């Protein structure tokens, strides 16, 4: 046996030049794709913004064209999904996770257009979903598209070009190269056996796409939270506690995301019409909320900075938390195209802040700043619901640049994952592949 | 398909027993690491204040600098040849082996040997880093508690071993993430999936990092300040720098190995000619650590100085050569202690010089050499160890200049890319492969 190792060891880190070059193209495409998608959502959120101007006097009439603008845009997207690409509804990440096990198809000729224009409308109407959904799936697809179109062959190149698309796709959505890389190797990568996913390949794609995102979205953070205070050792136990809280709520939130998913299915029955109408309903409800209480609706990024600066009351926080648990589920469990990742960043931020707010009053002797707990909590729901702690932590790091909070973050996030396990819940992106797969089976 | 649905639903489950044990492993490796750190200081200090007792007689002080290092070096080379041959050199390849179940983890032996062993090579001011000692000591500490708690399984053997190695790197650089990524990019049996639980490793890394902090709080090993940003029209420069690291990467591996051979003959294998050749290089270091500290030592001290563009282009090219020389001599020779840190220093220095030139060729880019120093710091690590992800995050964690993330990723990747196409190998892996071919032949 030993003699094969010595032949393997000496062959370690070799990635066929063909593959590498292709990842580069994959990356560049996904980047541009992602940037295009980003401009899209803006433009629409804008038209919407300036349509409430045309009707700025009649309060009842404006509440209307807010609802109908979101409703119409939402429907356009739910439809686009049910008609031409069922698999492109919801997140799409579990779908890409499947493709790595070779257990789901990558219908790129279908999904690319469907997901792109599909989300372009659910996000545009101001529903509570993130870009990661669309970009990661669009990412992998863009991945396979160039696999096919260059008739590249192999087990390596199929899983490797697919992964790097997914990474460059997450990278491009958060301006987070490392988060994109760690994402593959912690949530994606067929987690029960080793695969031929070349890390170096992924890297390249993530780079190329990050550079694309930068050619266009330079000079302004998604989240600018400033540089917060440090965290003294005698303060650490507090983050463990916060974690334990995220770790029990983690599962319960997964329960709901799935439950609510079921309970929503009945509404339409499966019927493309009752669906597209129920979509346009939630859709519209969002555009209504995005006007008369923006913190309850929308991606959630806007309220992150505000909440980390302790600029919300404890009331406004508990409100925003509930309103958002509600609009998040409604928007995602319902099957609209778009991620649940970002709205989870917002959820955890808000929760964490409230924790800090209390921590601050119970311990003046710790000289706390609630903001540090908001930052500890930002990737914490992601920790307990997705079981991607390493990924969340580095995502938040890349996005908020408060490295001093690394211990507090790791502790909240780990402590989150620990309790998500011992209270018995599952990787939400994985329990969703498992539903999907049990249904594709228990109908044959 | 039906097994997947049963596997997927079982994903992320790590036996509570293991987790609790990682915690202990971590705490131990932490304390271990901190103790080791105080040790090296204390000795570097005695040495410092021995050149005081003899502060007048220049020829006599050059002497007790050489002899103090020489004596301390020998004590350690010996301690290795006599009781634990495997604890010489880095020890990481040794731990890498144990993950394939292809090398023994003689903890009852190596712990004391590596600890006191390095305590002397580092103390005497040789050019080697704490990672060597801590990572190996780490895994050992790992197995020690596996055995002593008769824990069983394939999971718990590779898990508890990895988390020790991680907590061990973590503790050496105050780098939790770098420690975690380190396992899953350089360690983890890279040809098949293993039962190394990430969540397990994490916990140990944490516990050990908190130990390192209970004692080494307030004071960053490398305080480089917050450097300037890097404009897109500036990125191609870091690609070029990487291509340079990527061709030098292999050549440095050639030497580390070659020089390793060429040094073997010196002592033949003979524990006496070895311990004497050790004490020789040892002493040469303490001599250099006085009359030119930048050529000797761990190298951390000169990082800040070089990133602030406080060396001349001359002093840089000198320090680079003198250091390639002392680094090889110190590591290829078999002394206990890592090559990681001296690679950080090597890359920093190289990068700076690159920046210095970049600055004069392009006043229109408003460059700061410092950014290229930071791009280069993990770059040799990229091309020689093929751990780019790990280097990047190590430098990130140590220098807190996240704005340089693109420049860094680009230099590092571009480094790894050329290390491949110019045909070189993961140095920590070519070393397991030598070791293994000799235990076979």
């Amino acid at each position, epitope marked *: 046996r030993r003699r094969q190792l010595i032949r393997q060891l000496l062959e370690r880190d070799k990635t066929p030049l063909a593959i590498l070059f292709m990842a580069a193209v994959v990356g560049t495409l996904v980047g541009l794709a992602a940037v295009a998608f980003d401009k899209g959502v803006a433009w629409l959120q804008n038209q919407r913004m300036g349509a409430l101007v045309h009707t700025a006097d009649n309060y009842p009439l404006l509440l209307t064209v807010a609802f109908l603008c979101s409703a119409v845009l939402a429907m356009f997207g739910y439809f686009l999904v049910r008609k031409y690409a069922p698999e492109a509804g919801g997140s799409g990440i579990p779908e890409i996770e499947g493709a790595l096990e070779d257990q789901r198809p990558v219908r790129w000729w279908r999904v690319l257009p469907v997901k792109f224009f599909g989300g372009l409308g659910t996000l545009g109407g101001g529903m509570v979903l993130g870009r990661e959904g669309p970009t990661v799936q669009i990412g992998g697809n863009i991945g396979r598209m160039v696999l096919d179109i260059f008739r590249l062959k192999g087990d390596e190149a199929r899983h490797t070009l697919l992964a790097t698309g997914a990474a460059a796709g997450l990278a491009a959505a958060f301006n987070a190269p490392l988060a994109g890389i760690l994402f593959i190797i912690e949530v994606m990568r067929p987690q029960f056996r080793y695969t031929l996913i070349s890390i170096k390949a992924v890297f390249i794609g993530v780079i190329m796409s990050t550079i694309m995102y930068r050619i266009f979205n*330079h000079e302004v953070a998604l989240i600018d939270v400033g540089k917060l205070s440090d965290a003294p050792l005698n303060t650490l136990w507090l983050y463990l506690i916060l974690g334990i809280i995220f770790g029990i709520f983690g599962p319960i939130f997964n329960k709901w995301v799935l439950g609510m998913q079921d309970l929503l299915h009945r509404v339409h029955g499966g019927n493309i019409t009752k669906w597209v109408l129920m979509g346009g309903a939630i859709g519209g409800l969002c555009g209504l909320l995005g006007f008369v209480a923006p913190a309850t609706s929308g991606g959630g990024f806007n309220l992150i900075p505000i909440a980390t600066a302790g600029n919300f009351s404890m009331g406004m926080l508990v409100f925003i938390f509930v309103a958002r648990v509600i609009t998040t589920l409604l928007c995602f469990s319902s099957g609209a195209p778009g991620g649940i990742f970002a709205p989870m960043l917002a959820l955890g931020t808000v929760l964490g802040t409230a924790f800090g707010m209390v921590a601050v009053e119970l311990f003046p002797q710790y000289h706390l700043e609630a903001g540090t707990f908001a930052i500890a909590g930002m990737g914490a729901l992601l920790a307990a619901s997705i079981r991607a702690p390493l990924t969340g932590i580095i995502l938040v790091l890349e996005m908020t640049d408060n490295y001093q909070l690394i211990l507090p973050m790791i502790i909240t996030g780990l402590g989150a994952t620990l309790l998500a396990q011992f209270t018995g819940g599952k990787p939400l992106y994985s329990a969703i592949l498992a539903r999907t797969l049990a249904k594709q089976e228990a109908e044959q | 398909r039906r097994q997947l649905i049963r596997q997927l639903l079982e994903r992320d489950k790590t036996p509570l027993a293991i987790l609790f044990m990682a915690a202990v492993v971590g705490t131990l490796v932490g304390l271990a690491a901190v103790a080791f750190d105080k040790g090296v200081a204390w000795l570097q200090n005695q040495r410092m204040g021995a050149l005081v007792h003899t502060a007048d007689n220049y020829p006599l002080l050059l002497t007790v600098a050489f002899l103090c290092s020489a004596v301390l070096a020998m004590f350690g080379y010996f301690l290795v040849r006599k009781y634990a041959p495997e604890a010489g050199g880095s020890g990481i390849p040794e731990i890498e082996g144990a993950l394939e179940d292809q090398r023994p983890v003689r903890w009852w032996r190596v712990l004391p040997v590596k600890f006191f062993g390095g305590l002397g090579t580092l103390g005497g001011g040789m050019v080697l880093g704490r990672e060597g000692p801590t990572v190996q000591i780490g895994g050992n500490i790992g197995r020690m508690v596996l055995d002593i708690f008769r824990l069983k399984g394939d999971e718990a053997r590779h898990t508890l071993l990895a988390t020790g190695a991680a907590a061990g790197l973590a503790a050496a650089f105050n780098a939790p993430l770098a420690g975690i990524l380190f396992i899953i990019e350089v360690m983890r049996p890279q040809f098949r999936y293993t039962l190394i639980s990430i969540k397990a490793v994490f916990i140990g890394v944490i516990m050990s990092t908190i130990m390192y902090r209970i004692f080494n709080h307030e004071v960053a090993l490398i305080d480089v300040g917050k450097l300037s940003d890097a404009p897109l*029209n500036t990125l191609w420069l870091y690609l070029i720098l990487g291509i340079i690291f990527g061709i030098f990467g292999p050549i440095f591996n050639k030497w580390v190995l070659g020089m390793q051979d060429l040094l073997h003959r010196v002592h033949g294998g003979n524990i006496t000619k070895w311990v004497l050749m050790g004490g020789a290089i040892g002493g040469l270091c303490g001599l250099l650590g006085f009359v030119a500290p930048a050529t000797s030592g761990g190298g951390f001290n000169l990082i800040p100085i070089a990133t602030a563009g406080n060396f001349s282009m001359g002093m840089l090219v000198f320090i680079f050569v003198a250091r390639v020389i002392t680094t090889l001599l110190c590591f290829s020779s078999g002394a206990p202690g890592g090559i990681f840190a001296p690679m950080l220093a090597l890359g920093t220095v190289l990068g700076t010089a690159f920046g210095m030139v970049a600055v004069e060729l392009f006043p*229109q880019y*408003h460059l700061e050499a410092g950014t290229f120093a930071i791009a280069g710091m993990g770059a040799l690590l990229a091309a020689s160890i093929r751990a780019p992800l790990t280097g990047i995050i190590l430098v990130l964690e140590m220098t807190d200049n996240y704005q340089l993330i693109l420049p860094m990723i680009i230099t590092g990747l571009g480094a790894t890319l050329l290390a491949q196409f110019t045909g070189g190998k993961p140095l920590y892996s070519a070393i397991l492969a030598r070791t293994l071919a000799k235990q076979e032949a």
Partner: antibody, heavy 120, light 107 residues
Framework: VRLLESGGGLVQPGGSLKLSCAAS????????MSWVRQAPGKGLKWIGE????????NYTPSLKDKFIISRDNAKDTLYLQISKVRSEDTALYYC??????????????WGAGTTVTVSS | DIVLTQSPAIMSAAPGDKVTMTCSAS?????IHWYQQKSGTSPKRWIY???KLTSGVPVRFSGSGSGTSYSLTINTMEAEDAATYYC?????????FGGGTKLEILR
């Protein structure tokens, strides 16, 4: 964010003066600072720039110690010293914060000016 | 040092016109900038990297060019656009400014 330059006025030919630029409303380290001047009725001319750690200081092609650009981040203030002032030095002196987009640098934000008049 | 020469030294136009000034450079430049300078006032960064508008600059403004020829147009000029437009390169060192198109209004 404000740049408020000062110390312009009457100087005798062959003399010398120290214009100062007071910076406020932004982290005055972090930024390269610069001086540009407008001769009366005429166009813009770059005098020089200084990086935040005063370790780079470029000038326009001109004579050895003609201009001396310096900064003092302690005081959030840029300085310009002009020597052996001749009449061509009579102008409006602008203080500018430097920045970039793709990376070809530009004069981001400008002060109001002080005027230097060289006259017997 | 690159010499930038701006086409019309002075020019006139009725609001509503499409107005267009020119920056020509002696050697090659890339991503040049523009500062409008309204009267008795300090220059304001207007267009940059050849065609990005600074925040605030009304959208009637646009930039373009490459090589040795750049322009700073203004689809449907307005009366308040009356300024002297200076162009500037820093793709080569040292930076250099153009001479100046003076925009003169016709009521």
């Amino acid at each position: 964010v404000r740049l408020l330059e000062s110390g312009g006025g009457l100087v005798q030919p062959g003399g010398s003066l120290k214009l100062s630029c007071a910076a406020s409303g932004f982290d005055y380290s972090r930024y390269w600072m610069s001086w540009v001047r407008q001769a009366p009725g005429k166009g813009l001319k770059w005098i020089g720039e200084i990086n935040p750690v005063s370790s780079t200081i470029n000038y326009t092609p001109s004579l050895k110690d003609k201009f001396i650009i310096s900064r003092d981040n302690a005081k959030d203030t840029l300085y310009l010293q002009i020597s052996k002032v001749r009449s061509e030095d009579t102008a409006l002196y602008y203080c500018a914060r430097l920045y970039y987009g793709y990376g070809y640098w530009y004069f981001d934000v400008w002060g109001a000016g002080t005027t230097v008049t060289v006259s017997s | 040092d690159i010499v930038l020469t701006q086409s019309p030294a002075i020019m006139s136009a009725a609001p509503g016109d499409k107005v267009t000034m020119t920056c020509s450079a002696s050697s090659s430049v890339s991503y040049i900038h523009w500062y409008q300078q309204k009267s008795g006032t300090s220059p304001k960064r207007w267009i940059y990297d050849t065609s990005k508008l600074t925040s605030g600059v009304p959208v009637r403004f646009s930039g373009s060019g490459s090589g040795t020829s750049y322009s700073l147009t203004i689809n449907t000029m307005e009366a308040e656009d009356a300024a002297t437009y200076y162009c500037q390169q820093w793709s080569s060192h040292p930076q250099t400014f153009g001479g100046g198109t003076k925009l003169e209004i016709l009521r």
